[PDB]
């Protein structure tokens, strides 16, 4: 009864090793959730947006490693809000294998704040709420040390922030959170 979509930051600043670390993390997260009724989908975002696999694609090939392996980093700027809209509209759509009456979960992993985005969070968040999309955020690195950067995460995520926001020091620290998130992807 769960439909998990990943919105992964593939912007320039993420070094190749750290991108593969994030790829490996997503992979691991899917392996650990081998429940016949859990479907996964992935979109990469920067200034460009790419669907790597739909819920339909995943159902027809449930191997997480085979799906994650070919993903190549987009590079460029950060347009988080547009990504969220494109997830809600494209990934969570019946044509792409999205199951109605199944829990809508979005996991956002980002290394920095959105900038130069045509859309704002006020243009995307209410629609995601309306569609019943529970969203989790993993803020990676030093970009999320300020108070204004932290509120961005709290905006991105579902209320309360204490139950939906993660923050890690670096991409190597993603291995360290592989537990408490599994204990958040249940129903």
């Amino acid at each position, epitope marked *: 009864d769960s439909d998990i979509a990943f919105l992964i930051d593939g912007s320039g*600043s993420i070094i190749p090793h750290d991108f593969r670390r994030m790829k490996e993390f997503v992979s691991t997260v899917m392996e650990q959730l081998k429940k016949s009724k859990t479907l996964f989908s992935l979109m990469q975002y920067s200034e460009e947006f790419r669907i790597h696999f739909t819920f339909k694609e995943f159902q027809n090939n449930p191997n997480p490693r085979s799906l994650v392996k070919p993903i190549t980093q987009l590079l460029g700027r950060t347009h988080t809000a547009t990504g969220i809209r494109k997830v809600v509209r494209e990934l969570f759509n019946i044509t792409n294998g999205a199951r109605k009456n199944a829990f809508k979960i979005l996991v956002v992993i980002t290394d*920095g704040e959105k*900038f130069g985005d045509p859309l704002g969070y006020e243009d995307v968040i209410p629609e995601a709420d309306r569609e019943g999309v529970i969203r989790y955020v993993i803020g990676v690195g030093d970009a999320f040390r300020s108070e204004k950067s932290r509120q961005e995460l709290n905006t991105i995520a579902s209320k309360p922030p204490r139950d939906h926001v993660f923050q890690v020091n670096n991409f190597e620290a993603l291995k360290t959170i592989q537990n408490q998130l599994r204990e958040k992807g249940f129903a």
Partner: antibody
Amino acid sequence: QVQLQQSGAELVKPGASVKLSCTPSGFNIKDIYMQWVKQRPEQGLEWIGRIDPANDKTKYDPKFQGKATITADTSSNTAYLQLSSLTSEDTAVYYCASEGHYGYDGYAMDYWGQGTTVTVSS
Amino acid sequence: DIEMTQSPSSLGVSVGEKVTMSCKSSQNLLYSSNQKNYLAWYQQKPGQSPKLLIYWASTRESGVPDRFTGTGSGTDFTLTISSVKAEDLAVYYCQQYYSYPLTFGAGTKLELKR
């Protein structure tokens, strides 16, 4: 030893189409964002748009929507600009420029082509 | 669209003088996450293509002499030539590369005063 080589000067009739090319003789197009910039005689620089030749994803200035089409051919390591339904307003110098990927969220335009003259006259 | 407002449009220069050029954007160009200003300066010599001179508002591109100095943050930016050489007579354009559409300033033409 690393430069952007552009196609020759063009003379075209109004309402026609024209296709300009840009070939980097020093690096691979997949590794950059290829940009096109318009420069009318005595006017500044006007950004047309850019392409990610790695996935063929483009962005344009809405002013150029319809008029310009940016394409790339990784095989021949060439980026193209197509201008359609030409008017005298299209008579300018066209530069291709590259934005390298250097480990930051974006970058400036580090390499520029020599320019391609495009004249539109009946 | 972000508006790049360059001042002055033309500038009377003598060799060895210290010149300044202004570039002001309608929007902030400092990205919080990397603490970098998404501003570049280009030099376009007569009948030549533009050339990247300064990026990140203050970083000199390889080959650029120390006489050229970029300063500023957020909105107000300055290009400074300490001791102008004759080879420096050109049009200087500023560009924002923070968001799309990428926008250029009107340019500052340096001319020799007499």
